[PDB]
Write an enzyme that holds these catalytic residues in place. Sequence first.
Site, PDB file in Angstrom:
ATOM      1  N   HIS A 238       0.750  -1.267   0.116  1.00  0.00           N
ATOM      2  CA  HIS A 238      -0.054  -0.005   0.001  1.00  0.00           C
ATOM      3  C   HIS A 238       0.696   1.308   0.058  1.00  0.00           C
ATOM      4  O   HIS A 238       0.275   2.388  -0.408  1.00  0.00           O
ATOM      5  CB  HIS A 238      -1.169  -0.179   1.100  1.00  0.00           C
ATOM      6  CG  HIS A 238      -0.479   0.006   2.579  1.00  0.00           C
ATOM      7  ND1 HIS A 238      -0.494  -0.928   3.270  1.00  0.00           N
ATOM      8  CD2 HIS A 238      -0.269   1.185   3.302  1.00  0.00           C
ATOM      9  CE1 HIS A 238      -0.177  -0.250   4.507  1.00  0.00           C
ATOM     10  NE2 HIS A 238       0.107   0.742   4.449  1.00  0.00           N
TER      11      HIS A 238
ATOM     12  N   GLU B 227       0.946  -8.279   0.544  1.00  0.00           N
ATOM     13  CA  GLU B 227       1.000  -7.213   1.143  1.00  0.00           C
ATOM     14  C   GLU B 227       2.706  -6.930   1.206  1.00  0.00           C
ATOM     15  O   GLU B 227       3.061  -5.815   2.050  1.00  0.00           O
ATOM     16  CB  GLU B 227       0.482  -7.146   2.652  1.00  0.00           C
ATOM     17  CG  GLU B 227       0.268  -5.459   2.977  1.00  0.00           C
ATOM     18  CD  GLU B 227      -1.064  -4.683   1.990  1.00  0.00           C
ATOM     19  OE1 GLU B 227      -1.676  -5.459   1.516  1.00  0.00           O
ATOM     20  OE2 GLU B 227      -0.951  -3.573   2.267  1.00  0.00           O
TER      21      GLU B 227
ATOM     22  N   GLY C 109       1.256   5.392  11.082  1.00  0.00           N
ATOM     23  CA  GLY C 109       2.651   5.780  11.527  1.00  0.00           C
ATOM     24  C   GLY C 109       3.394   4.592  11.626  1.00  0.00           C
ATOM     25  O   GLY C 109       4.714   4.591  11.555  1.00  0.00           O
TER      26      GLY C 109
ATOM     27  N   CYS D 100       3.229   1.338  10.104  1.00  0.00           N
ATOM     28  CA  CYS D 100       3.266   0.568   8.788  1.00  0.00           C
ATOM     29  C   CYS D 100       4.612   0.621   8.256  1.00  0.00           C
ATOM     30  O   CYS D 100       5.273   1.516   8.183  1.00  0.00           O
ATOM     31  CB  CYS D 100       2.402   0.946   7.625  1.00  0.00           C
ATOM     32  SG  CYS D 100       0.755   0.512   8.460  1.00  0.00           S
TER      33      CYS D 100
END
Length: 182
Positions: A41, A72, A146, A148
């Site tokens: 992402h 991911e 904050g 990730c």
Amino acid sequence: MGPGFDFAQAIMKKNTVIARTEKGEFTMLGVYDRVAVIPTHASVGEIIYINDVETRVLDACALRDLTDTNLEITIVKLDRNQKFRDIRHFLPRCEDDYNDAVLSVHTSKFPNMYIPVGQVTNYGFLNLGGTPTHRILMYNFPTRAGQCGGVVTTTGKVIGIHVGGNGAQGFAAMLLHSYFTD
Ligand SMILES: Cc1ccc(CS(N)(=O)=O)cc1F
């Protein structure tokens, strides 16, 4: 404070950079040579900022499982003049549960942050921001915007990178040895 934080610190001090994309600032784990991981992402492009330095992205791949399911995990090869310490021998070979894990974050906003998240479950399937996702680890800590890209470790193993939360639980994408066997 103890051997969990000691291992986490040793990884953060040598194997992390601050990555900036158009989607924001992330903790980014260097694994070996010029190869690093970030959450998909982050939307890595042709150019990325590494510790505020404009860096060409030599090669990039979003990992999807053998059903075309998002994991991911985005692997990036950076046009950087320096290699990372090779930490592939700290990566698990299999999907597993873990005790006593630490989530470590280093950004402009959250420098030198270490969170004892405790027990980690092999959760498997998660609908993550609307995207079906496999190989998710879960821990019962209320992680926030904050964190990730934050590194999840136990004493002796680097097991995943933080990719989201629901306010009560946090979720990480597994890192496996197989992802980096060059
Ligand atoms: C861009 C990129 C670099 C390195 C790796 C690890 S490997 N060579 O074992 O597949 C994956 C990648 F997707």
